[PDB]
């Protein structure tokens, strides 16, 4: 496996988005992963609709702005036969009527693949060979809310009880040794103004810090 990976530099990742006051990070994590797999498949980067997931995936077990899961979103896109673009089904950060339009669909999946729970090396192999990976993490801390740069490490983090979906777009290390100061490159959905241009470096190979490898998955396109 490569010493570092950053899918943003290969065209797989859309600009950072903002869920605003809606508990839809699970939908942004899911569209981010699907954006990367559709790009690997077709060569075209197309922003996908979180609102389509918020409004339409209640049958699969999501609850819109009240929370949800990336795996349930990939199940909806499979059962539904498609997912609309961000442009055609815009984000408004509130629960609304399902307005899925098949003629506006620009993505499909047949289900999803799960990374072995708790295994950071399995997650590293998925990030290096597949593309961006959906993951859940413990983001319930003011240190995360006010994160600005460097490798994020929080003593009070949980690897088991998670509360926020995000997207791992790569991994790397600080300094000249490719071990030591390793980190996961994570895309958030709190806007470009949050953190480091919308991203956060989370400590890597430090006992599954904040649960990044506890519930990771990616769509099969």
């Amino acid at each position: 496996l490569p010493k570092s990976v950053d899918w943003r530099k290969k065209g797989y990742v859309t600009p950072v988005k903002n869920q605003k006051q809606c508990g839809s990070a699970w939908a942004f994590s899911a569209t981010g992963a699907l954006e990367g797999q559709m790009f690997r498949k077709t060569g075209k980067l197309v922003s996908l609709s979180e609102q389509n997931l918020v409004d339409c995936s209640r049958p699969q077990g999501n609850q819109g702005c009240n929370g949800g899961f990336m795996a349930r979103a990939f199940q909806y896109v499979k059962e539904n036969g498609g997912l609309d673009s961000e442009e055609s089904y815009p984000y408004v950060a509130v629960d609304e009527i399902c307005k899925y339009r098949p003629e506006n669909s620009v993505a499909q999946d047949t289900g999803f693949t799960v990374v072995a729970p708790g295994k950071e090396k399995a997650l590293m192999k998925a990030v290096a060979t597949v593309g961006p990976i959906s993951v859940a993490m413990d983001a319930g801390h003011s240190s995360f809310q006010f994160y600005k740069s460097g490798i994020y490490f929080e003593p009070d983090c949980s690897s088991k009880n998670l509360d926020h979906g995000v997207l791992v777009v790569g991994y790397g290390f600080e300094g000249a040794n490719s071990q030591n100061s390793k980190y996961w490159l994570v895309k958030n959905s709190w806007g470009p103004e949050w953190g480091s241009n919308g991203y956060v470096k989370i400590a890597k190979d430090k006992n599954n810090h904040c649960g990044i490898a506890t519930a990771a998955s990616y769509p099969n396109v």
Binding site: G67, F69, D163
Partner: peptide, 4 residues
């Protein structure tokens, strides 16, 4: 649900 869970992730928010």
């Amino acid at each position: 649900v869970a992730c928010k």
